[PDB]
Design a protein around this ligand. Structure first.
Ligand code: SF4
Ligand code: SF4
Ligand SMILES: [Zn+2]
Ligand SMILES: [Zn+2]
Ligand SMILES: [Zn+2]
Ligand SMILES: [Zn+2]
Lengths: 303, 304
């Protein structure tokens, strides 16, 4: 029903804030420039850096890898196959597809193969959601550490951070609120984690994926409070535009207030940053040996 | 359904904790819940002169009704904002409420003591901004001049949760530093309490209906952000019950974290009330040269 603000081509998307109608080609350029600005603003990455993009098969990580590669970054991708039968199989396939289109090396880690059982197979009263996050985070860091990557880039966008903030404020998880934001610096054996999509919304991600022809898993894991928070914040954004941004940017200014609400050791098994004698990952899976994630070359590209 | 304690038919269902109560059992429960809030946060004693700031709305009406039923030494104050077509019936609803409650009502008319009502001032500033400042001053000055020990407001759980949610979204750390059910006596500032702090609006609406309390449902003409936050929190309460309470109680524990975000106090050159500069915010705004004396010998309805 409209036309592009910079050309005679028909409008593809309307940016709710700031108001402007852009076509496919102009939206891509805008979205890419918005990401580059997020990198520049928070000093996330340099061009002389080995980056590991944690791809899951979803839209978020797919676009992160695509944009970073288009912006000329030294990226490689990692897929952690959780081993959820009927889910994780096509999830691995979507990532292979995504990385082939992107033109980036893809490394695959299969939980069922290295640990024994997949997520939702462990004889535990603990929900799969609780230990899945802990398992994904460990393999992400250990893989990047063992292969000497400078940084880890996740798919987490503005909607993801706002819903994370809203949930944590409601439950007053001050320790989690203390360590949030677009960058988590290199501290010990913990690799620097960045969020290049921190300032963009899910609608801009969905639209970007569609335009660049990126296929992803829309369906979410069978084992959620996240979708509740996101809908609540979308309702608020309708009435008052800019809410999500002003809330997230405001949080970054006041993030210093939660510092006294947060407190160290090295694991006896994997030597990774632990709280006690043995780390949370090693204690859970009952591991006696260290998983070595060092690889000479990818599955698709050996030698 | 039927009542959990008698053969009488259910009047209301408490979403958390789950129980069906009749009119007579709900009143008793609601009253006990308020008494517990008083006891828990050490809000009031029986040997205290209390001023309930009644507005004509459900909140302040119930606060006065419950406190009087719990045997407290209450007197009520109505601040008539002078909003033509609104403030007139608002004053009438309070007169009605206090007559039912059986409490002395003191009326202060803005248009009469200041000159112009709220929304009549030649200012680009919205009426909502200076109305709150004006209500707060008269509330404190009246309680101070008549030597009341405390001020009790109608603010309930939904009011606090929406206040918290809005202030967190705008990261107003200074406002978040000084929240909660009690604001103690500091200088010429009178102790402010919230006896309805733990009860929800649905429990207030139901209590008013049961005790036969008529109030103004309609809100002031001067879009309000409060109704947005409340609807958002009601949506959250549906899916996850107890959310509002766990969020408010959790805030009280972490309230200490916003203390470094609030930094000497002065006395006004005109009214001698707690000021930031030479002249206070109230006196500077209305351009007052003289001090308004709120000391009264006896009420409008009960003179001599
Ligand atoms: S939603 Fe699924 S993938 Fe995400 S943390 Fe939970 S179990 Fe793991
Ligand atoms: S909503 Fe009306 S009564 Fe309430 S503070 Fe604003 S102007 Fe005053
Ligand atoms: Zn265009
Ligand atoms: Zn370990
Ligand atoms: Zn009953
Ligand atoms: Zn003054």
């Amino acid at each position: 029903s409209m036309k592009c603000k910079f050309c005679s081509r028909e409008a593809y998307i309307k940016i709710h804030y700031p108001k402007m109608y852009l076509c496919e080609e102009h939206f891509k350029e805008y979205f890419e420039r918005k990401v580059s600005r997020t990198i520049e603003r928070y000093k996330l990455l340099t061009k002389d850096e080995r980056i590991l993009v944690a791809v899951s098969g979803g839209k978020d990580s797919a676009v992160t890898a695509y944009v970073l590669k288009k912006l000329g970054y030294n990226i490689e991708c990692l897929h952690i196959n959780l081993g959820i039968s009927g889910y994780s199989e096509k999830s691995e396939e979507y990532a292979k597809k995504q990385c082939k289109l992107i033109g980036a090396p893809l490394h695959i880690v299969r939980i069922k193969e290295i640990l024994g059982y997949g997520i939702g197979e462990v004889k535990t009263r603990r929900p799969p959601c609780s230990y899945c996050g802990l398992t994904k985070r460990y393999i992400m860091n250990k893989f990047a550490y063992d292969n000497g990557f400078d940084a880890i880039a996740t798919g987490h966008n503005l909607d993801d951070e706002a819903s994370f903030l809203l949930n944590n404020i409601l439950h007053w998880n001050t320790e989690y609120l203390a360590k949030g934001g677009p960058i988590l610096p290199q501290q010990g054996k913990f690799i620097k984690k960045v969020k290049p999509l921190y300032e963009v919304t899910e609608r801009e991600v969905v639209a970007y994926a569609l335009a660049v022809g990126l296929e992803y898993i829309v369906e979410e894991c069978p084992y959620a409070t996240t979708l509740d928070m996101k809908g609540v914040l979308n309702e608020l954004e309708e009435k008052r535009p800019g809410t999500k941004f002003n809330f997230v940017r405001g949080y970054l200014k006041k993030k210093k207030l939660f510092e006294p609400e947060i407190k160290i050791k090295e694991c006896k098994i994997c030597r990774m940053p632990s709280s006690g004698d043995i780390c949370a990952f090693c204690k859970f899976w009952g591991l006696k040996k260290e998983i070595n994630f060092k690889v000479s070359s990818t599955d698709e590209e050996p030698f």
